[PDB]
Design a protein around this ligand. Sequence first.
Ligand SMILES: CO[C@H]1O[C@H](COS(=O)(=O)O)[C@@H](O[C@@H]2O[C@@H](C(=O)O)[C@@H](O[C@H]3O[C@H](COS(=O)(=O)O)[C@@H](O[C@@H]4O[C@H](C(=O)O)[C@@H](O[C@H]5O[C@H](COS(=O)(=O)O)[C@@H](O)[C@H](O)[C@H]5NS(=O)(=O)O)[C@H](O)[C@H]4O)[C@H](OS(=O)(=O)O)[C@H]3NS(=O)(=O)O)[C@H](O)[C@H]2OS(=O)(=O)O)[C@H](O)[C@H]1NS(=O)(=O)O
Ligand SMILES: CO[C@H]1O[C@H](COS(=O)(=O)O)[C@@H](O[C@@H]2O[C@@H](C(=O)O)[C@@H](O[C@H]3O[C@H](COS(=O)(=O)O)[C@@H](O[C@@H]4O[C@H](C(=O)O)[C@@H](O[C@H]5O[C@H](COS(=O)(=O)O)[C@@H](O)[C@H](O)[C@H]5NS(=O)(=O)O)[C@H](O)[C@H]4O)[C@H](OS(=O)(=O)O)[C@H]3NS(=O)(=O)O)[C@H](O)[C@H]2OS(=O)(=O)O)[C@H](O)[C@H]1NS(=O)(=O)O
Ligand SMILES: *[C@@H]1O[C@H](CO)[C@@H](O[C@@H]2O[C@H](CO)[C@@H](O[C@@H]3O[C@H](CO[C@H]4O[C@H](CO)[C@@H](O)[C@H](O)[C@@H]4O)[C@@H](O)[C@H](O[C@H]4O[C@H](CO)[C@@H](O)[C@H](O)[C@@H]4O)[C@@H]3O)[C@H](O)[C@H]2NC(C)=O)[C@H](O)[C@H]1NC(C)=O
Ligand SMILES: *[C@@H]1O[C@H](CO)[C@@H](O[C@@H]2O[C@H](CO)[C@@H](O)[C@H](O)[C@H]2NC(C)=O)[C@H](O)[C@H]1NC(C)=O
Ligand SMILES: *[C@@H]1O[C@H](CO)[C@@H](O[C@@H]2O[C@H](CO)[C@@H](O)[C@H](O)[C@H]2NC(C)=O)[C@H](O)[C@H]1NC(C)=O
Ligand SMILES: *[C@@H]1O[C@H](CO)[C@@H](O)[C@H](O)[C@H]1NC(C)=O
Ligand SMILES: *[C@@H]1O[C@H](CO)[C@@H](O)[C@H](O)[C@H]1NC(C)=O
Lengths: 404, 417
Amino acid sequence: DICTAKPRDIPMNPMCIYRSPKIPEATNRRVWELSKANSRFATTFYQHLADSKNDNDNIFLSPLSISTAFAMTKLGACNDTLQQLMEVFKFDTISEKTSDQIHFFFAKLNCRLYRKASSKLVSANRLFGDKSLTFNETYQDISELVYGAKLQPLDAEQSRAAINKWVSNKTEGRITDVIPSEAINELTVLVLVNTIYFKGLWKSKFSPENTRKELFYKADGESCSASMMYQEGKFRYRRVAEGTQVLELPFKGDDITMVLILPKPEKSLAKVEKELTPEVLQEWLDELEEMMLVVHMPRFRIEDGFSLKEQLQDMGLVDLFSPEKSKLPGIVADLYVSDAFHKAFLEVNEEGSEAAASTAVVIAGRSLNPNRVTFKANRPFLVFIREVPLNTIIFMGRVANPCV
Amino acid sequence: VDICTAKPRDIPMNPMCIYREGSEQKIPEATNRRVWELSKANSRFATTFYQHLADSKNDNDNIFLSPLSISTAFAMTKLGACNDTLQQLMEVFKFDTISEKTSDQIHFFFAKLNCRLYRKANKSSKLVSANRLFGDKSLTFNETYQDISELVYGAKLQPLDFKENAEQSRAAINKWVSNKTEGRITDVIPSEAINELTVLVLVNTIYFKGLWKSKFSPENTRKELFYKADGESCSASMMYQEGKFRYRRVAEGTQVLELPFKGDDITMVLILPKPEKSLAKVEKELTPEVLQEWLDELEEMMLVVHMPRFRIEDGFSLKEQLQDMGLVDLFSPEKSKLPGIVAEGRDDLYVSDAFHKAFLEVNEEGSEAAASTAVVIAGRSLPNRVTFKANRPFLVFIREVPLNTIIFMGRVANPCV
Ligand SMILES: CO[C@H]1O[C@H](COS(=O)(=O)O)[C@@H](O[C@@H]2O[C@@H](C(=O)O)[C@@H](O[C@H]3O[C@H](COS(=O)(=O)O)[C@@H](O[C@@H]4O[C@H](C(=O)O)[C@@H](O[C@H]5O[C@H](COS(=O)(=O)O)[C@@H](O)[C@H](O)[C@H]5NS(=O)(=O)O)[C@H](O)[C@H]4O)[C@H](OS(=O)(=O)O)[C@H]3NS(=O)(=O)O)[C@H](O)[C@H]2OS(=O)(=O)O)[C@H](O)[C@H]1NS(=O)(=O)O
Ligand SMILES: CO[C@H]1O[C@H](COS(=O)(=O)O)[C@@H](O[C@@H]2O[C@@H](C(=O)O)[C@@H](O[C@H]3O[C@H](COS(=O)(=O)O)[C@@H](O[C@@H]4O[C@H](C(=O)O)[C@@H](O[C@H]5O[C@H](COS(=O)(=O)O)[C@@H](O)[C@H](O)[C@H]5NS(=O)(=O)O)[C@H](O)[C@H]4O)[C@H](OS(=O)(=O)O)[C@H]3NS(=O)(=O)O)[C@H](O)[C@H]2OS(=O)(=O)O)[C@H](O)[C@H]1NS(=O)(=O)O
Ligand SMILES: *[C@@H]1O[C@H](CO)[C@@H](O[C@@H]2O[C@H](CO)[C@@H](O[C@@H]3O[C@H](CO[C@H]4O[C@H](CO)[C@@H](O)[C@H](O)[C@@H]4O)[C@@H](O)[C@H](O[C@H]4O[C@H](CO)[C@@H](O)[C@H](O)[C@@H]4O)[C@@H]3O)[C@H](O)[C@H]2NC(C)=O)[C@H](O)[C@H]1NC(C)=O
Ligand SMILES: *[C@@H]1O[C@H](CO)[C@@H](O[C@@H]2O[C@H](CO)[C@@H](O)[C@H](O)[C@H]2NC(C)=O)[C@H](O)[C@H]1NC(C)=O
Ligand SMILES: *[C@@H]1O[C@H](CO)[C@@H](O[C@@H]2O[C@H](CO)[C@@H](O)[C@H](O)[C@H]2NC(C)=O)[C@H](O)[C@H]1NC(C)=O
Ligand SMILES: *[C@@H]1O[C@H](CO)[C@@H](O)[C@H](O)[C@H]1NC(C)=O
Ligand SMILES: *[C@@H]1O[C@H](CO)[C@@H](O)[C@H](O)[C@H]1NC(C)=O
C-alpha cells in the first residue's frame, strides 16, 4: 500500500545516490517540496518544447507524468548519467531524504492528486525491456510497488503490438498506436512509455444551445471557423501585468481546475511563453478575484505524441541516450535508453473534459451590467490543469489552432 | 343537492335567457370530455386576454393574474345576463367554441370543473376557492338567482348597507377577500368605486401554496446584481439546483421548463426565450395548442436550474381590456341587460366596473400565490397602478396537470427581492 504506508515499512533505496556539492493544511512536508520542484521543471521544459515548435502547432503534455517516468530510471542510474538526470529534472533542488526516496514520494504525490475523487484521471505507464537481459528482482518490486508495475520484458514488432495494444487495454481505445512503426529495431534496447489524459465535468457547465460559429485568428495571419462556446457567470479572473488576461474555470469538486492565459492582441503568445517562471505563475494565480463576466471559448481536441529524446538531450540529458556513456546497473541484475515516448489527449466542450453527455442549463432572472468584462479567446492562449489546494501542474499545453 | 356528484338531469338549472372536424382530441385517463373542453375554452380566453394586457404595457413591466378566477367571476355574472349582453359574454369568454351540450350548461360543468380542481387532497399542496355575492340591504333579489348562485358556485348573498354607507361596506368586502387569501390580497376594490347607487358586487377568490417536489437548498443560494433598462441596478437572490426535470428546447431556441409541486397534480412552467431574441415574439405566438404541444413534448432530463427567490403583485381594472375584445353592452347604463338578479327595487343595472389583483411568491421551500376578481354593479365608473420598468423577463405558469388548467400566468421582469 502506498496511499498511507511509510518508508520505514518498505526499505526501497537506490543502488547509487547523489550529492550536489506557506505550508498547507494536512500536507506531507516532503510531497509538497517534491511538488514545487516539478512545477519549476514543467515551466522550463515547456519553454524548450514551445521554442522548437512552429507557432501554429498545438501542444499538450503532463509534465508531472514525464518527471515521474524519468524519476524511475534515476533509481538504477549512476555517475554522469545520474548527475545529468538529477540536474535536469530539478531533482537536486530538494532535501536529501526526499531525493533518495524520490520515486516513493512521487507515488505518494500521485495517490493524492488521484484521491481527487468524481471526475476520473486515467493513466498508462510502463517500462519495456528486452528479454535477453535479466533485471533486478528488487528494482522490479519497488517498481510494481511504486510505479504501478514492473518493467515488462519483450524482445520483434508484435512488440509494437504488445505496447500500443497494452495501452489500448488501459486507455480503452482513448490512447492507441503510441509508438510509430519505426522506433524498434536491431537496437531496441530499453524504452519508456508514458501516456495520460483527463476525464472531468465543469463545475459550471456551458449550454450547447448557445454555441455560435465565430472566427479564430491563427499565428500566420489567416483566420478560420471555430465552435465558440458561451456562458454568463461568476469566475476567478484577473487582468495581470501588461494586459495578459488570466481566467480560471474549475471542474466539479473544486480541487482541479483549468487556468487559461490569453495575451493581448498585440503581444504574441510566444512572448508570454518566454516569461513563464514559477514565481510569476503563482503570483498571477494570487491576484485572481471573483466577478461576473461573460466567457467565450472555442472547443478543441488535442492529441500530442512525441519523443522526449531530441528535446531532453538538447537540454543536457545526453548520457542516458548513449550506448557508450550510459549507466543503469540498477535494473540489470551495460544497458542504455533508446527512446522515451509521451502521449496526452485532451478534449473539451460544453460539459467538460472527455465528458460526453447532453445537459441543459436554464437561468432565469439574470441581467448582467452592459459595462461587463468578456473573455473572448479568439486567438492563441495557453492552458493549465492544476490541482488545488496543492497547486500541482498536471497538464500544461497550448491551443494555437482549434479549427479543422 | 350535491353538484359534485349530480347530473344535468337531477338538478336542472334554469336561468332566464338561453342562446346559440377540427376539435382534435388529446384527452387523458379519468377525464370527462366536457370538463376538459370547458377548461380548454377557458384557456383560450386566458391567452387572448394576456396578449391584450401585455400589448398595453411597456415590455419591461410585470404581469400577473388568475385567468381562471376572472372567468369564474363573469360566468357567475352571466346568470343574470340576457340578450346582446349575453352573446358578447359567451363569445368574449370563448364559450361559444364548444359543443351544444356544454355551450348550453357552462355552469354545471364549471361546477364539476371546480369540483376536480378543488377536491381536498395532497395536504402538502393546498388549493382552494371562495365565492360570495354582495347585495344592498334593501332589495328583493330574484329567489332563483340566489339559488343557482349558491348551488353551482357556492356563493351566498350577504347584505350590506350600500345606499347610505358605501365605504363601511367597501371595507367589508375587501376584508372578506383578505381572509380568503391568507392576507395576501387586500383592497381589491379601489376607493370610491362603490357609491350609494351600487346594487350588487360579485367576488371570487383563489388561493395556493405548495412545496417543491424537489426542493432547492438555501445553502447554495447567492445574491447577484440586476441591471434594469433605466440604468439602475438592484439585488437578486438567485437559486440553484441540479436534477431531473421535464425540459424542451422548443423552436426559435426557446426553452420551456417545468417544476412540479408535491403531488404532481400541479406544476409551474417557466418559459425563457433565446438569450438575444424577442420575448414579445413568443407572447404573440401563444395559444392553447402551442402550450399543449410544447408540454406534451417535454422529455425528462438532467439539467441545472438558476431561478430567483422573488415576489410580485398586479392590480388593475379589467374594463378597458374586455371592451377591446368585444364586451360592450355590459358596461353601458343603456345597452346593459341583467334582468335576472333583482326582483323589485331597482331599474335595470349595468357594470360600473370590475377589478382584479394577484400575488406570487417563490423559493427553496416552494411557492404561494393568490388572486381575486370583483364585479361591481351600478357604482362609480373609474385608473392606473404600479408601473415599474425592469429588464430581461421570462414567462411563468401554474397549472393543474390532469387537464391543463391555467390557474395563474404572467411575466416576471424584476426578480430583485
Ligand atoms: C540528513 O538527515 C536526513 O536523513 C535522516 C534519516 O533518513 S532516513 O530515514 O533515510 O534514515 C532524516 O531523519 C529521518 O526523517 C524524519 C523526517 O522525515 O522528519 C523521520 O521521518 C519519519 O517520521 C516523520 C515525522 O513523523 S511524525 O510522527 O513526527 O509526524 C514523518 O514525517 C511526517 O509524515 C507524515 C505522513 O507521511 O503522513 C506527514 O503527514 C502530513 O501529511 C499528511 C498527508 O500527506 S500527503 O502526502 O500530503 O497526502 C497529512 O495526512 C498529515 O495530517 C500531515 N501532518 S501535519 O502535521 O502536517 O498535519 C507529516 O507532515 C510529516 O512530518 C516521515 O514520514 S515521511 O512520509 O515523510 O517519510 C517518517 N518517515 S519514516 O522514517 O519512514 O517513518 C525519521 O524518523 C528520521 O529518522 S531519524 O533517524 O529519526 O532521523 C533527516 O530528516 C534527513 N534530513 S534531510 O534529508 O536533509 O531533510
Ligand atoms: C345535440 O346533441 C347534444 O345534446 C345531446 C343531449 O344533451 S342534453 O343532455 O342537454 O339533452 C347529448 O346527448 C346526451 O349527452 C350524452 C353525453 O354526455 O355524451 C349523455 O350524457 C349522459 O351519459 C354520459 C355517458 O355516460 S356513461 O355511462 O357512458 O359513462 C355521461 O358522460 C360521462 O360522464 C362521466 C362522469 O361525469 O362521471 C364521465 O366520467 C369520466 O370522467 C370522470 C371525472 O370527471 S372529471 O370532471 O374530469 O373529474 C371520471 O370519474 C370517470 O372515470 C370518467 N369516465 S371513464 O370511463 O373515462 O373512467 C364520462 O367520461 C362521461 O362519458 C353524462 O354525464 S355528463 O356529466 O357528461 O352529463 C350523462 N349526462 S346525463 O344526460 O344526465 O345522463 C346523455 O345520455 C345524452 O343524451 S342521450 O339522449 O342519451 O343521447 C349529445 O351528446 C350532444 N352532442 S354534443 O353537444 O355535440 O356533444
Ligand atoms: C377574518 O377571520 C378572523 C378570524 O379568523 C375574524 O376575526 C375573528 O373575530 C371574532 C369576533 O370578532 C373573534 O372572536 C372573539 O374572541 C374573543 C376572545 O378571543 C381572544 O382572546 C385571547 C386574546 O388574548 C386569545 O386567546 C384569542 O385567540 C383571541 O385573541 C371573545 O371574547 C369574543 O366573544 C365575545 O366578545 C364580545 C363580548 O363582550 C361580543 O362583542 C362578541 O359578540 C362575543 O360575545 C369573540 O368571540 C376572533 O378572535 C377573531 N379572529 C382572531 C382569532 O383574530 C374576522 O372577523 C374575519 N374577517 C371578516 C370580518 O370577515
Ligand atoms: C485488459 O486486461 C485486463 C487484465 O487485467 C482485463 O480485465 C479483466 O476483464 C474481464 C472481462 O473481460 C473482467 O471479468 C475482469 O474482472 C478484468 N480484470 C481481471 C484482473 O481479469 C481486460 O479485459 C483487458 N482488456 C480490456 C480492454 O478490458
Ligand atoms: C326571477 O327569474 C325567474 C326566471 O329565472 C322568473 O320566473 C320564471 O322563471 C321561468 C324559468 O326560467 C321562466 O320561464 C318564466 O318566464 C319566469 N316567469 C314566470 C313566473 O313565468 C321570475 O319572474 C324572476 N323574478 C322576478 C320577480 O322578476
Ligand atoms: C561513475 O561514478 C561512480 C561513483 O558513483 C564510480 O564508482 C564509477 O567508476 C564511475 N564510472 C562509471 C562508468 O561507473
Ligand atoms: C331580449 O331577449 C328575449 C329573449 O331572451 C326577447 O324575447 C326580447 O324581445 C329581447 N329584448 C330586446 C332587448 O330586444
